[model samples]
Target chain A: ADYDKYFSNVQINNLSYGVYTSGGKESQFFCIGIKRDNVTLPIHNMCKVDVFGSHKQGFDAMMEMAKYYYATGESIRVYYKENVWSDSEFKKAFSTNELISLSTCSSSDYCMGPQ
Target chain B: ADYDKYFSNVQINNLSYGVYTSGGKESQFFCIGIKRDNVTLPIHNMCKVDVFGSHKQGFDAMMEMAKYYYATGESIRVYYKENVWSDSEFKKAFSTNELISLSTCSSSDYCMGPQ
Candidate 1:
């Protein structure tokens, strides 16, 4: 597709896509935009997220989601206990994607820190 | 973060995310929104994208970007020949994030039809 098809289908209408994981670190994730054209290197193309969000399972939580995404054109969303937590501290704590998007861990080596 | 922080940071002002990989399929990518609080499954929380774009390298492109993001908190961007191609194809030419955001390849398995 060229400019016309690209512009029309890509949904520059604030369009976005992401890759999230429960295996990067204790609480790590990633992000990548599906349509953006401002880059120096072709490698710095996707989005990366590293914040505070917890997951219950291991690394495979993302595997299933990816399968559904690539197989059915659907990104699965995932969430844990934090949704219903009656916080005794800050209001609107820290939260991130729960899989819903077509995503996976940065790598299979789950570690620590937001990198 | 809850209603307050979630609403504040997630950029209700049209925040988007995506996951891309040369491993999936040639010229095929995907999208997933980050702040979509409307869903049923906990795993269906992230966004998914199945679109069109081209990449030169293999799946490793996303890996470098993910590392940049995970390490220095910066999403890398990637682009291919499409940019310089004064195409007689579509025009605008479909595009995706070049690892600009924190992200990575969907899986070791790659194939598809926008799904």
Candidate 2:
């Protein structure tokens, strides 16, 4: 399925982060929930973002933006890419996509591409 | 902080599952984003549930319930407990709580406690 898409007038629903342990190994995660338009349910409705590596710097800023929008009831545009699960068990258990980027919505038109 | 609490008229914003790899170890996660009342931004607004071991049986049922509420716009009450991170770096990186249980809300009264 072509999962690369964007949502406009997206409300920030929730933000979360966690460190989970299984079999003596620890895994870290950060997730954000953007409200769906519900005209159709897309698979990328929820997004997980990178909290470590080069993306770390952007993480906090994105979170602050999300919180700002959440508080003020403002809308934002979110661009996301779907991440297919490699593990069959995990694929069956938990299905979510990854976030690509976020932007402010344009007043006149649905902003399409940064490319 | 005392993080065990419940939210009424709770809406399911999104559901996500993922497996992340770092340093040759794989960490699995299943997360659900819930719409908050916004009267207060409680830390448990977004919850991560267990996807493995004894809790696995309940996970699918819970997901179905969440999806039902998400689709139908029905309100449910969520009970959650806060999970403090043991790793300081992870604690700094991602901060969220854990899901304890989910239940139907009563019409006449604000529901509280199974005990």
Candidate 3:
């Protein structure tokens, strides 16, 4: 509901390999792009994000996303506003290969604040 | 030589899309797997790590590698001990699709710890 509202003006592209559980907080529910000025909406929780807009933007976002899961813990799932250039670029700027990579989380634990 | 010595028991398979620089600290030089008990050796610097033994291991490692390049700035480059089970598994378990994904680093900055 909130996710729909926040991204109401645009189409949110949520990419996932499996399912996602809001669990408690929704801050980390959405992974966004840093370059998307169109996404005026701000994430309420830290758990709700992965912000890579430029080149390394996705990298940082993925790191944070990994933090959410590694700390909490997926197959994989992601969302971004449609037409958002940053989001699109981020979605494409990575190499899937023979390396240990971090993944998305089933739930978020940081949106509330630091523990 | 150091990396080879550290991974002498096996082939330290280094995979990258481009290139890498040793930079200053070697602590974060290597991103390893948490699962491979065979990798008895431990990383010295904090910058030299990304530990996911199972599925998400590669995910987290990629995130850190992104930080290295994002903060320091890649095409990409990676190395792993030969025949290390975790390393091989991590190398393959990932999605190469949409959504912002983090890449590797040209240099590392965290091995020394705390900016």
Candidate 1 residue lDDT tens string, B1-115 = 1111111112111223334344455333322222223422221112113335432222233333323323432211211121222221312322321222222223223210011
Q: Write the per-residue lDDT of candidate 2 for residues A1-115, one digit (tens) a residue.
A: 1224667667666666665554445544455666754433354344453423322223443444455556655455665656774433333433556654454343434332232
**Candidate 2, residue A33: CA error in Å?**
21
Regions of model 2 farther than 4 Å from truth: A1-115, B1-4, B36-38, B49-57, B85-94, B112-115
* TM-score ranking, high to low: 2, 3, 1
Global fold similarity of model 1 (TM-score)? 0.20
- For all the predictions, what are the DockQ values? 0.02, 0.02, 0.02
Off by over 4 Å in 3: A1-27, A33-115, B5-66, B74-80, B86-115
> TM-score of A-chain in each prediction?
0.21, 0.61, 0.21
Q: Give the per-residue lDDT of model 3 (tens digit) for A26-93.
A: 22223322212234334311112322221122333444444433332222222322223222222353
Candidate 3: residue B35 lDDT (0-100): 16
Kindly list the per-residue Cα lDDT of model 1 for residues A48-76, writing each as its tens digit: 23233433443334433432333343322
TM-score of each: 0.20, 0.42, 0.22
How many residue pairs clash in model 2? 0
